[PDB]
Amino acid sequence: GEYVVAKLDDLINWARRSSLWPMTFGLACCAVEMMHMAAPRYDMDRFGVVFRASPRQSDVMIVAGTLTNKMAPALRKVYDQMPEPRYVVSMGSCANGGGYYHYSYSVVRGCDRIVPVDIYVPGCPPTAEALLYGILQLQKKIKREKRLRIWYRR
């Protein structure tokens, strides 16, 4: 039976990582490099990552830019609306830890104070390629999941 569960886990993992539909929170300059990842040279859609998805149809949230205090409740509301399984990719220094604005009165010092984060992409901004590296790193993280294996040992 362990052979069947291991194969079933592999199938659902393959489907979920082969079909990552992102909801992009294009908050600032990091959104532009996200655009260049959707652009022809890198074509994120060729990996099965559609260009744009509504929050209720998205599998991954990409926080691409500075998260201010005024914005934080809105971002948390959208995260709570995502169907599961859901993942968060934090892109750029601002989202990772506040970046250039870490010491400002109006900025959240890292989006991981508001939502759990799966992947941190460094850079100000990360290059389009660097973000793509992070997405492919998220895929490998999903490939490691063993949800059904852990379910049947409960």
């Binding site: 590296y133 790193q137 490998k140 993280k141 490939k143």
Partner: protein, 144 residues
């Protein structure tokens, strides 16, 4: 010309060593182009070029199937490219390390490591300074 186009498509099957080799690269790299082998690194990554392709597609690497004890037949990473080939592959230079080798230093890593995040080899930060204030240690003998 459609026959020349189809002949070239057939020549890719033979250029990759037959049907099996053609299918392996098709499924590993989603690409069946045949280039000129520029060199191979000590980890097994192979580097190819075809200057008739447009800038950006004129150089590529076919990653090794195993690197530092990790099966990489399907799990390939951009960080598997070692630094000496990294420069060539990103077009920071024209000359591969087979033509212009890097300068040797005793302290340079002999073995490249890829991204180790998420594994037991991941970096964990810590303070590198020693304790600043020394506390008084009371005497071990009794005398109140």
């Amino acid at each position: 010309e459609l026959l020349q186009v189809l002949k070239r498509g057939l020549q890719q099957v033979s250029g990759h060593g037959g049907l099996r080799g053609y299918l392996r690269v098709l499924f590993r790299a989603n690409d069946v182009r045949v280039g000129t082998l520029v060199g191979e690194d000590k980890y097994g990554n192979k580097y190819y070029e075809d200057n008739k392709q447009f800038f950006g597609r004129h150089r590529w690497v076919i990653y090794t199937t195993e690197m530092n004890g990790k099966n990489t037949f399907w799990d390939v990473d951009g960080s598997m490219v070692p630094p000496e080939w990294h420069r060539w592959l990103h077009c920071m230079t024209d000359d591969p390390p087979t033509v212009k080798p890097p300068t040797a230093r005793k302290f340079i890593w002999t073995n490249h490591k890829f991204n180790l995040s998420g594994t037991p080899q991941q970096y964990v930060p810590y303070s590198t300074t020693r304790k600043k204030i020394q506390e008084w240690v009371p005497p071990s003998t009794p005398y109140k």
